[PDB]
Every structure is written in C-alpha cells, then in structure tokens.
Structure 1
C-alpha cells in the first residue's frame, strides 16, 4: 500500500529552514530551548507540546488559527527539534519536565495557562497541571497519554512490541535505523509528506547513534503497570486521578479518525469531566492531515473559554 501527496500542499508548504527562522533560542538551565512565540495578546498563553519523533514544526499549520485570540508559544522539547541537548544525556519524562518548567519561568506567563498536548507532550502538560493546579485555564489534548495501561480491556495486547523496544534489538532499531522518524512517523500520517516536510522532521535525527536517544527514551517511558518505569506509572496515576476530578477545568479532546489506538485513548479521555469532544480525520499525527480543522476547533474552544470566564 502507498500514499499520495496532497496536490495543494506545496503552495502553502513551510520548510524546516522557514520554520526555524521564525523561532528563537534562549538559555534554559545548562542548555537552551528553541521555540516559536507569536507574542501578541499576551494576557493569555496557549502552549503547544509535541511528543515523540516530532518538534514544534508539527504545529506550524495549526497555530495561525489561534494566534489572533491568544499568545501562542511552541517549544522544541530538550534533545529534539533545534533545541539544546540535556546536560546529562538523559531524556526521561522528568528530564523533559525539568527543562520545560525552567523554560516556563522565563516566558512571563499569565497566572492561568492554556495547554495543547499531543502524545507524550500531553503527559508533560498533565503532569504540570497536577503539580500546578492553580495555573491551568484549559487543556486541549489528542492522541495522548491519558492513563496507565493496566490490562488489555481497551488496549490491544502490545506486550511483544513493548518487550522489543525495551531490548537491545529495539535500541538498534532506533539509534541505528531511526525507526520512529523514518518508519512510524510517515506510517501514521495519511497523506504523503512533501520531501521538504519530511526533511524537517529528519534533520535533528539525521545522524546515526546517540543523538536519536530521545526517540528511544520516550517509548520506554510507557506507563505500563507491569514492567513500566514505576516513577512514570505513579506520575500518570496521579494526574489521571486529578483529571477525573477536575470538573471545573474546561477541556477539549480532538479525536482522530481512525486514529491510532484511538479506542483506548478515547475511553480514557471520556473519564475527564468537562470535555468537549470533536473529531477530525487522521491517524496518530493528525496535525499533518487536518491542521486547519484542528486550528478552528481549538480557536472556538479558546474563545468560548475566554468568554465564559468573563
């Protein structure tokens, strides 16, 4: 089976260099963060968090829809995109969280922040919210790490694949063969990316070896109760319980159709009260198939949240 280019994409296409020229770099702890900042309307802040294999580039066609209503800030996570590397070479969830929260404290953020999370980027937003429950205005999430994996009731039995990624054979798949960037990323986009678009995802991880570590450390953080990292499992248990009780926190979930393990994620997402559910066509990286529909849904949601707090 093959995929085809979107014939109208090249006229709107934003290349890697075009995106990176719109970004800025700032020191954060012992390293630095590359990020996009739309600057205007700073009384609110909408922070977009990518997950594994991607970078701020993922949001490039989504964010213009929201910039007119609120300041939009989009980082490259540490070790990813054009950001600096982690000082100790470690890329666990808490390593990312350490750099991400240090970056927040330098951005002049409002008291209450809006988060937009994908993949493990949503796990970071959820953990931040659990630890700063008075700093959260709204949360948008999608194809997200919503809860632990405790059984195969909703999740397909992925045990054999998890054992693979945790093995030395999985390490070679990532560090030598770039599995998540070269294979998973295009497999989980419906359209075919333009060559320049794939090149922007490939560029941080173009060289073999240890530079690819973040794309191996992320799946090894999976919150599988039996065999997962117990510190990550606890983080996810804690913020899941918080989210299930957060009746007063308005949320938006963008379902992807047919998505990627969608059923398990939706069933977890349904347990969080005050969630508006919308749906777009896509797989895992739904930003690359329905960015304008997503941007419009997010814009209306933010507008509604702002109008009803006032």
Structure 2
C-alpha cells in the first residue's frame, strides 16, 4: 500500500507553478515549451523525459545541477505544454525532427550533456550517434539501451495488442499509460496536484493522447518491431558500446520494474559509472534529490577532467 511522502507538500511544485517558469519558442511549424535556467551557458545539460510525462518530471532534480551548468528541459512535441506536430505524427523521428530544430535556436555550446529517461534517452542516444562531436557526457536511466531479441515473457502479445485498434481504445479512450501505468510505477503516492500536472495535457479524450500510444508502438522488438526504429537503436547501441571517450552515468532503479535487461544493456557501454536510487520506473518521483546530487557530482567531475 502506497503512502504520501509526509514532507513532500511543503516543497510541492504544481503544474501551474512549473509552467509559469517555462518559456516558449517557435520551432518549424509549431512551438516547444521548455524550462531554461539560463546561467552558466558555457555548458548545457538537456534533460529529456519519455512516455506519459513532460519537463515536469525533472522539477525536483534540476535545482541541484543549475548552479554548475545551464539546464534546459523541453516538453517533447505533442506532450506537456508544447505545440503539436504539424502532421499529427509522433514517431521517434517526428520527435527528433522537432527536438533537433529546437536545439538550433538555443545557442548551445559545442559539447552538450544529456540526461535521458525512457524514450528521452533514445532521443539523446540517436542525437549522439548523429552528432558524435557534440556530446560531453550522457546520464541515462530506465532507458531504451538496445533492441529486444528476447521478465516480460508475453511482451510480443502485449505489443501486438497495443498495435491493434484496441491500443487506440486503451489510450485515446481510456488513457492507459497516463492514468493507469504512470501511478503504478511510482513508489510513493503522488499529491493530487502532481498527478494533475501529468494528466493535464491529456485530460481530454481522443487524438490529443496520440503521443502516449505512438511511443510504445515504436518499441524496438527485433521480432515485429518497426524495422526503421530497430535499425536506429542497433546503430546507436553499436556506437555507445565503442564510446570509451564519452563519460556516462547510469542511474539504476531499486527495485526497478523488469529493469534487469536495461542494466545489463547499460553495462555494455564503456566509461559508465553506476549508481542506484529508490524507484520503480519513474524514479525522479521517488529519489529526486539523490538523483540530482549524483548528476551534479558527475557533471562537476566531467567538467574537471575535461
């Protein structure tokens, strides 16, 4: 039985409070909502959320890192308070189209530090693969580290379901990932206002919820997965396994949820330091300060050493 953190309300940041601190910038035919700490712009730490979430995920993590480097946290296209995609498509490369276009307008330094979770990590990894000169370090967690060739025995049957018209009902009609999966993968009970911040972009039924269905349908299952995403992930996985000069931090979840394959995948990338914090999947909600402190020390060490 999950309980409220009795000390959390004293520092709670509501959706409105977070969004008030964000900025918007026109990108291609749409716009990106994002948080930008601005100061210390000689470095840039870009935090990338994944499915069901938004920049809001990082709200308690980022304060620890701001004093050492400019921190920048977007809402991916179609998610959070960002604009929608011009053609209503939300595949990995649609997200990547807007993300990379957005980067071009941020006055970034030559080498960028990424912090990625879930599909946000996939975006960071793909960016790194295509810009191998532009990466100072990578922090990742609960990340799409590799393809799936084989904890989740019926994964194929589940992905087959999510790819059927039942997936449309599960998500567009019934908001499966936001309203059911998200709270199940946080160890504490979220304050009502915190859950409301996650629900808000997806509060209405129908097509607005598309990004939360499109993400799982991108799953790089070797057997049945979209072959283009499978190849993207094979490509960046090979590159990461050879990236000895790229400092990395893997933040492992304890106990995690079916996370053994992620950890083993992560251990195939050289120059990775491993740390562990409490959580299931959305570990930012269970150990944000331990995460922030780990990320801060890592960044500091990377900037020294360099």
Q: Shared fold by TM > 0.5?
A: yes
What's the counterpart of residue 54 of structure 1? 53
Deviation at 1:227, TM superposition (A): 0.5
Deviation at 1:167, TM superposition (A): 1.1
CA deviations 1:216-255 (Å, max 9, x no partner) are 0000000001111010000000000000000010000000
Is this contact kept in 2: 1:155–1:264, CA < 8 A? Answer: no
Cα drift, residue 157 of structure 1: 4.0
- CA drift of 1:160 comes to 1.6
Q: Secondary structure at the match of 2:171?
A: helix
Alpha-carbon shift at residue 265 of structure 1 (Å): 0.1
Structure 1 residue 77 displacement after superposition: 0.1
Q: Per the alignment, do residues 156 and 296 of structure 1 end up closer, same or farther by CA in structure 2, a change over 3 Å counting? A: farther
State the secondary structure of the residue aligned to 1:211.
helix
How far apart, CA to CA, are the structure 2 residues paired with 1:265 and 1:186? 21
User: Pick from 212, 222, 245: which aligns with 2:219?
Assistant: 222
1:26–1:32 Cα contact (<8 Å) kept? yes
The structural deviation recorded for 1:162 is 1.1
Q: Distance in 2 between matches of 1:62 and 1:260?
A: 21
Partner of 2:179: 182
SS at match of 1:308: coil
Counterpart-to-counterpart distance in 2, 1:36 and 1:307: 26
Question: Is residue 149–residue 155 contact of structure 1 (8 Å, CA) maintained in 2?
Answer: no
Alignment of 1:61-76 (within 5 A): 61-76=60-75
Please name the residue that 1:291 is paired with: 288
User: What is aligned with 2:251?
Assistant: 254
Could you tell me which runs of 5 or more consecutive residues in structure 2 were left unpaired when the two chains were aligned: none
Q: Which moved more, 1:5-14 or 1:161-170?
A: 161-170
C-alpha deviation, 1:155, in angstroms: 5.6
Q: Could you tell me how far 1:113 is from its partner in structure 2?
A: 0.2
Aligned partners of 1:224, 1:213: CA distance in 2, in Å? 20
Question: C-alpha deviations, 1:112-143, integer Å up to 9, x for none?
Answer: 00000000000000000000000000000000
Q: CA deviation at 1:149?
A: 0.3
Q: CA deviation at 1:156?
A: 3.8
Root-mean-square deviation over aligned CA pairs: 0.8
**Is the CA contact (8 Å cut-off) linking 1:45 and 1:73 kept in structure 2?**
yes
Q: Aligned partners of 2:268, 2:283: CA distance in 1, in Å?
A: 22
1:170 CA drift (Å): 1.6
Q: Is the 8 A contact 1:122 1:144 kept in 2?
A: yes
Distance across 1 between alignment mates of 2:153 and 2:296: 34
Of the candidates 153, 156, 160, which is equivalent to residue 159 of structure 1? Answer: 156
* Cα shift readout 1:178-210 (whole Å, capped 9, x = no counterpart): 000000000000000000000000000000000
Contact map agreement 1:123 1:146 (CA 8 A) in 2: yes
Query: What is the deviation of 1:262?
Result: 1.2
1:56 CA drift (Å): 0.0
CA–CA distance in structure 1, aligned partners of residues 119 and 257 of structure 2: 14
SS in 1 for 2:278: strand
Give the Å deviation of 1:284: 0.3
